[PDB]
Design a protein around this ligand. Structure first.
Ligand SMILES: *CC(=O)Nc1ccc(NC(=O)C*)cc1
Length: 129
């Protein structure tokens, strides 16, 4: 199987909540072609759904090097840092995801802006404690 076919099989497993199996298929595609960003971005989300944040950080770091303009990778990076309460970095990454989304016209409705507000509100909440 080619790397593209492996990404498609990992995608099918992800839709069925098969997160660990999907991450294995994404690692497959990385072995075959390790220079495609979305392979890391998709597996990062698998790790993110698996409560393994440090693992999710790494893949978000790998994706943003192959594609510094990736809206999805910045979005998962910020959400991952948010769940780890790294609020300032998280808001900065969600903000850049929003900036890139408007540049590439990937800003749909109030989606990413609502993520910003939820992150900023959670940051305000923790500062008080
Ligand atoms: C195709 C696919 O994976 N869709 C999808 C829909 C919803 C969610 N999760 C929630 O709505 C909370 C994940 C994936």
């Amino acid at each position: 199987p080619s790397a593209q076919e492996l990404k498609e099989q990992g995608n099918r497993l992800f839709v069925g909540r098969k997160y660990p199996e999907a991450a294995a298929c994404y690692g497959r595609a990385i072995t075959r072609n390790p220079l495609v960003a979305v392979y890391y971005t998709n597996r990062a989300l698998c790790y993110l759904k698996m409560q393994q944040h440090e693992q999710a950080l790494a893949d978000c770091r790998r994706a943003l090097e192959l594609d510094g303009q990736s809206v999805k990778a910045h979005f998962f990076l910020g959400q991952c840092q948010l769940e780890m309460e790294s609020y300032d970095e998280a808001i900065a990454n969600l903000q850049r995801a929003y900036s890139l989304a408007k540049e590439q016209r990937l800003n749909f409705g109030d989606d990413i802006p609502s993520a910003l507000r939820i992150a900023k509100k959670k940051r305000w909440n923790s500062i008080e404690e």
